[PDB]
């Protein structure tokens, strides 16, 4: 049975099914609250390359959605856009009811395209997408979401700015998945797992200040050095 | 008791939530737009209550997960309600001695 | 991977004072940094830590005492307000080490810097 | 706020034995551990960290190990060049959650 924490005392335990433990007091619904909680609370690597590695595609298995009615301010939020070569879509369209999460701090707004197996999009550590007051467990087209797990406990008797990264990549869903954090319609940065996303704004920044960007119509890529991480190479 | 088996641990937890408890603000007409019907929230203190119940949070997915898999709701939104009617009824289900170790009547 | 500090001197109390802590084979953009005080023949005393967001954590005994800053481009500062005699101390800076996994959690602080001296 | 204790406060060993080090935490926190060597007049040198894993350079003669609240760290064939002050941190919370997480001080001889 889904398990049930009771607070006492300051203190958190499970509910015992067995046991009837007489001092537990329940006078209204008001009481009990669900709660959802990130996944980068436990310490777990955020950025893209390393995210978009826990998510599977697969058919055969019809999507759930369930409730919550508070959430954790996120400071990484993921919104994804994912074409197949033919130019068809793979991520179903949002249902009437399911918008964004509320509060991020940065958005990796991640457009691509991929080989894009199965129908829907399943998190392999079994995980929710918490979208906002909904957690689902597929992703949908073009939806702000944080991944997390949802809670369910007793009550005890009683600015916001966001920021959108912008990146592209290619063969999506793959072992061999290369991505690159775009500055300007026509000059990109490959990326790396080791990089915040404030190092990515200043490289932005540095690089509109140094005169950088394209001028011609082909395209440029930089590749920033390993050793000196500030002589951005090509 | 529940022990925190991650890796680590935010102690601190900073929540946003719905509820709320003016003038013509209740009216839909008039009321905010949809992106301003939240609030904050911070619990800084904590006697481990934070780091717990992510635990909890981790513990109890594999059981939302079953129950999810084996009900055709599209949405589910009655979790809570069979939660107060499995709690009403262990608490008082049937046939209750006043002085049985099953019970919450208590003499005086 | 280098850091050092600068600044250490001998003033009366209330007299205010700034170190400065500048880096080396790393991006401030990248990292945290954190100040670590010690008196001499005692134990280590964590001060505060300034993110790579910008923000800055002080800690509860010196909630208002110390501020810590980012100046330049590779320099960081702490500033010390109404100094008294308590604290004549070695003043260290160091930067927080994360072996994958994700931001803001660190497992140890490597680059210690040689440290200033601060008497009053 | 996990508290940690060191609980030898000060050991002396004749050269070449092994020495063992106790560092006690109040609650759990897995295998979150740092260890750190500080010569004097010299700013504290990295040693170990997750509790297990030797750092970049240290000789393989320091050797850390323990789980949950109890840890343990020893030097096995000690030498005169191994004589200072050891702590032990704990690297359990957020690099944001400020505190007193560092350890008493072991006077090795």
């Known amino acids: 049975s889904i398990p049930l924490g009771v607070i006492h005392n300051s203190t958190l335990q499970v509910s015992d099914v067995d046991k009837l433990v007489c001092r537990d007091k329940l006078s209204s619904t008001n009481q009990l609250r669900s709660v959802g909680l990130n996944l980068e609370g436990n310490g777990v690597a955020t950025d893209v390359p390393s995210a978009t590695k826990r998510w599977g595609f697969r058919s055969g298995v019809p999507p759930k959605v369930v409730n919550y009615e508070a959430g954790e301010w996120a400071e990484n939020c993921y919104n994804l856009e994912i074409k197949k070569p033919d130019g068809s879509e793979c991520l179903p369209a949002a249902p009437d009811g399911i918008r964004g999460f509320p509060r991020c701090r940065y958005v990796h707004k991640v457009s691509g395209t991929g080989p894009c197996a199965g129908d829907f999009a399943f998190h392999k550590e079994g995980a929710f997408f918490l979208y906002d007051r909904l957690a689902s467990t597929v992703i949908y087209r073009g939806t702000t979401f944080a991944e997390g797990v949802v809670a369910f406990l007793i009550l005890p008797q009683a600015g916001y700015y966001s920021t959108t990264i912008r990146y592209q990549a290619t063969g999506f869903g793959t072992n061999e998945t290369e991505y690159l954090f775009e500055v300007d319609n026509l000059t990109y940065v490959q990326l790396e797992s080791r990089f915040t996303p404030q190092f990515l704004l200043q490289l932005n920044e540095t690089i509109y200040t140094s005169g950088k960007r394209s001028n011609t119509t082909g395209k440029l890529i930089w590749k920033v050095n390993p050793e000196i991480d500030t002589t951005i190479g090509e | 008791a529940i022990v925190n088996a991650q890796p680590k641990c935010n102690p601190n937890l900073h929540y946003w939530t719905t509820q709320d408890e003016i003038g013509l603000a209740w009216i839909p007409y008039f009321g905010p737009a949809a992106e301003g019907i939240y609030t904050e929230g911070l619990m800084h203190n904590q006697d481990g209550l934070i780091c717990g119940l992510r635990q909890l949070a981790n513990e109890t997915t594999q059981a939302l997960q079953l129950f999810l898999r084996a009900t055709t709701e599209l949405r589910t939104f009655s979790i809570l309600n069979r939660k107060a009617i499995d709690f009403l009824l262990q608490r008082w289900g049937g046939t209750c001695h006043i002085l049985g170790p099953d019970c919450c009547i208590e003499p005086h | 991977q280098s850091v050092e500090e600068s600044g250490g001197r001998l003033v009366t109390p209330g007299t205010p004072l700034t170190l400065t802590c500048i880096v080396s084979?790393?991006?401030?953009?990248?990292?945290?940094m954190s100040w670590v005080r010690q008196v001499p023949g005692k134990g280590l005393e964590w001060i505060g830590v300034?993110?790579?967001?910008?923000?800055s954590s002080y800690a509860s005994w010196a909630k208002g005492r110390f501020t810590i800053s980012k100046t330049a481009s590779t320099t960081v500062d702490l500033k010390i307000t109404s100094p008294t005699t308590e604290d004549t101390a070695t003043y260290f800076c160091?930067?927080?080490?994360?072996?994958?996994?994700?931001?803001?959690?660190?497992?140890?602080?490597?680059?210690w810097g040689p440290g200033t001296l601060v008497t009053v | 706020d996990v508290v940690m204790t060191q609980t030898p406060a000060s050991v002396s060993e004749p050269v070449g034995g092994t020495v063992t080090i106790k560092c006690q935490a109040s609650?759990?926190?897995?295998?979150?551990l740092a260890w750190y060597q500080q010569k004097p007049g010299q700013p504290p040198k990295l040693l170990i960290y997750?509790?297990?894993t030797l750092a970049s350079g240290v000789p393989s003669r320091f050797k850390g190990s323990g789980s949950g609240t109890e840890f343990t760290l020893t030097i096995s064939d000690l030498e005169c060049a191994d004589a200072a002050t050891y702590y032990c941190?704990?690297?359990?919370?957020?690099?944001?959650?400020?505190?007193?997480?560092f350890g008493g001080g072991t006077e090795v001889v």
């Open positions: 609650q759990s926190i897995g295998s979150n």
């Open positions: 084979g790393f991006s401030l953009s990248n990292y945290y």
């Open positions: 941190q704990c690297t359990y919370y957020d690099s944001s959650y400020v505190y007193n997480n």
């Open positions: 160091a930067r927080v080490l994360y072996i994958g996994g994700g931001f803001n959690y660190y497992d140890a602080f490597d680059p």
């Open positions: 997750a509790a297990s």
């Open positions: 300034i993110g790579w967001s910008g923000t």
